[PDB]
Amino acid sequence: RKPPKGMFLSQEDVEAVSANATAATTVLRQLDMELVSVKRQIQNIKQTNSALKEKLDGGIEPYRLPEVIQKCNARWTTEEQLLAVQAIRKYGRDFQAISDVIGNKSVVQVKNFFVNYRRRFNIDEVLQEWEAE
Amino acid sequence: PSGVEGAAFQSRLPHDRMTSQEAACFPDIISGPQQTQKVFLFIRNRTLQLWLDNPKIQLTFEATLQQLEAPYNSDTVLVHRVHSYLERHGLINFGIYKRIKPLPTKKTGKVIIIGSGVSGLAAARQLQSFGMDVTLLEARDRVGGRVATFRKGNYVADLGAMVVTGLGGNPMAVVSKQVNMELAKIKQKCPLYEANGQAVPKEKDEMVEQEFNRLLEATSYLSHQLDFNVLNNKPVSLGQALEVVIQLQEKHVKDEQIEHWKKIVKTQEELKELLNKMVNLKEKIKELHQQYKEASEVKPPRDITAEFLVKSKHRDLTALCKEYDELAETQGKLEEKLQELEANPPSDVYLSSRDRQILDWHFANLEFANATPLSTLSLKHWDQDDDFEFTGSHLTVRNGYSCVPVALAEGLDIKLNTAVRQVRYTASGCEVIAVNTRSTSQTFIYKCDAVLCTLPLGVLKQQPPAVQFVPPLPEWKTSAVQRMGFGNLNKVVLCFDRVFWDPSVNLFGHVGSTTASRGELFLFWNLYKAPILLALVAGEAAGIMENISDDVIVGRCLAILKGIFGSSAVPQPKETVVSRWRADPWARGSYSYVAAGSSGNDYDLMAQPITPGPSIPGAPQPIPRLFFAGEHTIRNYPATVHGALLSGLREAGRIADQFLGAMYTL
Numbered sequence A: 001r002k003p004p005k006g007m008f009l010s011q012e013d014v015e016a017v018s019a020n021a022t023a024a025t026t027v028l029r030q031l032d033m034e035l036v037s038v039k040r041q042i043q044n045i046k047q048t049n050s051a052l053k054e055k056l057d058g059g060i061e062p063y064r065l066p067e068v069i070q071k072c073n074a075r076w077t078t079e080e081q082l083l084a085v086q087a088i089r090k091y092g093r094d095f096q097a098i099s100d101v102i103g104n105k106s107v108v109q110v111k112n113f114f115v116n117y118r119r120r121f122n123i124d125e126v127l128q129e130w131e132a133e
Numbered sequence B: 001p002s003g004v005e006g007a008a009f010q011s012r013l014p015h016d017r018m019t020s021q022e023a024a025c026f027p028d029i030i031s032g033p034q035q036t037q038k039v040f041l042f043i044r045n046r047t048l049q050l051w052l053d054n055p056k057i058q059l060t061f062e063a064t065l066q067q068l069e070a071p072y073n074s075d076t077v078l079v080h081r082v083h084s085y086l087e088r089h090g091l092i093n094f095g096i097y098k099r100i101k102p103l104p105t106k107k108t109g110k111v112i113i114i115g116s117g118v119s120g121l122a123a124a125r126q127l128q129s130f131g132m133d134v135t136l137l138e139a140r141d142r143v144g145g146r147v148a149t150f151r152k153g154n155y156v157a158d159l160g161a162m163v164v165t166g167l168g169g170n171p172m173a174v175v176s177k178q179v180n181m182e183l184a185k186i187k188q189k190c191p192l193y194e195a196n197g198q199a200v201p202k203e204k205d206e207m208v209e210q211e212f213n214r215l216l217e218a219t220s221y222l223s224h225q226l227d228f229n230v231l232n233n234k235p236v237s238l239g240q241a242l243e244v245v246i247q248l249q250e251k252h253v254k255d256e257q258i259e260h261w262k263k264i265v266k267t268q269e270e271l272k273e274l275l276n277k278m279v280n281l282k283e284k285i286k287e288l289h290q291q292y293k294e295a296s297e298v299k300p301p302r303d304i305t306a307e308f309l310v311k312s313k314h315r316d317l318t319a320l321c322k323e324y325d326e327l328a329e330t331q332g333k334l335e336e337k338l339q340e341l342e343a344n345p346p347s348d349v350y351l352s353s354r355d356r357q358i359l360d361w362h363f364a365n366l367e368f369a370n371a372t373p374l375s376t377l378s379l380k381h382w383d384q385d386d387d388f389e390f391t392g393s394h395l396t397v398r399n400g401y402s403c404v405p406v407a408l409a410e411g412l413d414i415k416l417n418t419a420v421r422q423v424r425y426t427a428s429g430c431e432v433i434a435v436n437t438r439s440t441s442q443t444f445i446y447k448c449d450a451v452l453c454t455l456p457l458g459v460l461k462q463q464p465p466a467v468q469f470v471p472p473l474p475e476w477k478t479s480a481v482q483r484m485g486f487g488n489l490n491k492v493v494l495c496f497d498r499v500f501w502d503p504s505v506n507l508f509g510h511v512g513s514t515t516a517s518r519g520e521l522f523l524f525w526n527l528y529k530a531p532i533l534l535a536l537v538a539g540e541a542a543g544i545m546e547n548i549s550d551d552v553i554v555g556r557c558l559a560i561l562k563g564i565f566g567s568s569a570v571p572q573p574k575e576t577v578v579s580r581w582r583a584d585p586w587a588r589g590s591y592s593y594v595a596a597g598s599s600g601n602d603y604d605l606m607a608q609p610i611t612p613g614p615s616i617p618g619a620p621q622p623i624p625r626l627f628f629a630g631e632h633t634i635r636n637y638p639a640t641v642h643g644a645l646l647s648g649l650r651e652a653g654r655i656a657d658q659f660l661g662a663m664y665t666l
Ligand SMILES: CNC(=O)c1cccc([C@@H]2C[C@@H](O)N3c4cc(C)c(C)cc4N(C[C@H](O)[C@H](O)[C@H](O)COP(=O)(O)OP(=O)(O)OC[C@H]4O[C@@H](n5cnc6c(N)ncnc65)[C@H](O)[C@@H]4O)C4=NC(=O)NC(=O)[C@@]423)c1
Pocket: B114, B115, B116, B117, B118, B119, B120, B137, B138, B139, B140, B143, B144, B145, B146, B147, B159, B160, B161, B162, B163, B164, B165, B369, B370, B418, B419, B420, B421, B454, B455, B456, B459, B466, B467, B489, B490, B491, B581, B585, B586, B587, B589, B590, B591, B592, B629, B630, B631, B632, B638, B639, B640, B641, B642, B644
C-alpha cells in the first residue's frame, strides 16, 4: 500500500524519468544546475550582507542618550503646559510621545489635559493643523 | 509442523483441503459431504506419513491399511483408491526403495525417454516400477545432465547443481534418506572484499545490503501498486525498474538539497532586508544626534519653542534608538538560525562510487540466483515462485551431487553416447532417431508408444534445430519456447594442496571494480573436505568469460585471491576445471528464468503433451504421444534439481494414466 520507508516513488515522478531515453539524466541535470545557481546566489547575498555589517561597526553606542528617571508629577506648570500644546502640534494623538516630551506626566493626564484645557488652548484647531501635515 | 499434518507439509500439500488434482481423481469425495472430505484427508496424510517415516522400503497397500485404525480403516476401497493415487503420482514409493512385491514378469507399453537428467531418471524409475518397458537415450557419456561432478583423486567438486534448498517440503529430503549423501549446512556468513583486497567494514556491508533489500521492495511497489509493467510497448524488466528506483532516490536527494539551501536564501534575504533597515536607521540616528546636540548648544534660559526642540529631539532619538534595538534582536534571531541550518545539511549523495560497487555485488548475487542479467527478468513475474520456497537452511553435498543421479540410474536401460536427432510421433506410435556421438554415421531407430522429452530448454531453443520434430511442434509450444528465458552461469573449480582461507566461512565475496564485470568471479565457496575453492561467474560476465581460455581465467582467480590473502599464501592450483554451460551442446545454458514478456503460464504450456493428428482422415481423435519434463516444465519449482525430479514424477503418472489406465477414479 505504501513504499518502503526512505524510498520516494511517485506516479508523477516515474513518468518524467521514463518519458524518453535520456529523461533521467535530463531531470537529474537540471537539479544539479538549480542547486549550483542557488548556491552561488547564497554566496552573493552572503557577501552583500557582509558589507552591510561593516557599515554598522560600533552599532549606535555613541548616539545613545542616558535614561531620564523622573518621578511623575500631577500639577501643570505653565512651562509643561506650553510644551504640551507644541507636542499636540507635532504628534497628533500619540499621547505616549507627548507624555515622553513633557517627561513628568503620564499618558492619562495627557488625555485629561486634552479635555480640561481643550477650550482655552484651542486644541481642536491645533489637531486640524497637524492633520494637514 | 508435526503429525499427519507434517506429512502433508513435507509433500507440498495442504492438510485441510483437497488439491485440484485430487478433485480430478476424487470428484465424488470433493462434491460430497464435508465429513467425507475430512476422512479422505486423514487417509492421505496418514499414508504420506507412513511413507515419509521410512522411505527405504515400499509402502504396500496392505501394510498401509494395517497401521490405519477405525473408522478410517472401515472403507477399504477409499484406502485402496488413496494409496494408488499417491503411488501413481509419486508422492509415495518414489526414489530408491526396496520392493516388497517384485515387479511383474512381463511389461506393458514402451516409452522412450530423451535425456537421463534427474527428470528423465525420475520418470524412468517410476514407469519401470509401474510395469512399463523404458529406455533412456542420453547424448553424454554419463547420466546426471546438469548434475555434473568433478572427480580426480580425493578431489570432488560439483560443476552443476551443488545446493539443496532446504528440507522443509523438499523431495530431496526423501532421496537423502534413500541414498547416503553427506549433506552439510551452509553458514550464511559472507564477508565481502573490495578490488583493493581488503574487507568491507561491517557498518558498510549492513547499510548496502539493507539498501539492496529496500530497493527490491521498491520495484515490487512499482510493479503491484503503480502498474508500471509496460514502457514503450515493451515489458519492463527488473533491471529497468531498479534503475528507475535508483534514479528517483538520486533525484530525491537533489530535491532535498535544493529545498535546504532554498531556506538559507530565504533567510539571508530576510536578513538583507533587515540590515538595509539598520543602515538607513543608523543614518537617521546620526542625523538626529547632531540635531539634538545643536539644540542642546543653545544656552538657557530658552524660550519654550527652543526647549520643546531639545525635549522633542530627545524623545525622537530614544524612539529610533529603540527600533534599532528591537531590530538588533531580530538580527540576532536570524544569525543563529543560519548557523543552525548550515550545520544540519541533508545527505550529500545517494550512493558513493564505492557504495554502488558494493551494491553491484548484491546484484551479481541476484543475477547468480536467476542465472541471467537483471535486464532480462520480468519485473512482474521474476519471483512468482517465492511462495513455494522450502523451509530450513540451504545445504551442500560434500561427496558430490552426482551420487544422486548415478543412484537413480541403477537398474535402468540407458543408452549413453546416443544423441536424438529426430522425434517422430503419429497416431499409431512414435519412432526416435538417434546417432552415436562418437561416430555419427551409426544410426539407431527406436520405436515406442510414447516419448518423454526432457531436452533442456536451451536445446529446444536452438536455431537451427539440434532435434527435429515430425510433425513440427505447434505454434503454442514453439512460442512458449521463444518467450521463456534460458540463463547461464559458470563455475571455476580451484584445486589446491593446502587450505589457505578461513575454514570457518563457507563462502566469501569479491567486489568488482565496475558494474559490467559485477558477475566476473564475484563469489567463492569452501564446501568440500579436500582443499577446493569454487568460484562463480554470473550475470553478463557468464556469457563473455566463455571466450576466454582456462589459464587466463585461473589467472584472474589467483589475482583476486592474492589480494585477499597476500601474494604468498596462494599456491598455484594443482587441478583446474572451468565450466562453459552455454557452449555445452546438450545444455546450451544453465537453467531457465522468467524472461520479461513471459510468465509462469509458459511453464505450463511447456508441460502440455502433444497429440498428433489422425492417420486416416475422420478416424477418432488419438492418444497423446509426446510428453515433456525437466526443470523448464514445472511452474512452481523451475530451474532446480528438486523441480526437475518433481516433473519426472509427474509425467510418469500422466503417462501411466494414459497407457495403463487409472482404476482409482470410480
Ligand atoms: C531460479 N533458480 C533457483 O531457484 C535455484 C535455487 C537454488 C539453487 C539453484 C542452483 C544454482 C546452481 O547452484 N545450481 C546449478 C548450477 C549450474 C551451473 C547449473 C547448470 C544448474 C544448477 N541448478 C539447476 C539444475 O541443475 C537443473 O535445473 C536440473 O539438474 C535439470 O535437470 P533436467 O531437467 O533433468 O535436465 P538435464 O539437462 O539434467 O537433463 C537433460 C539431459 O538431456 C540430455 N540431452 C540433451 N540433448 C540430448 C539429445 N539430443 N539426445 C539425448 N540426450 C540429450 C543431456 O545430456 C542431459 O542428460 C541448480 N539447481 C539446484 O537445485 N541446485 C543448484 O545447485 C543449482 C538455483
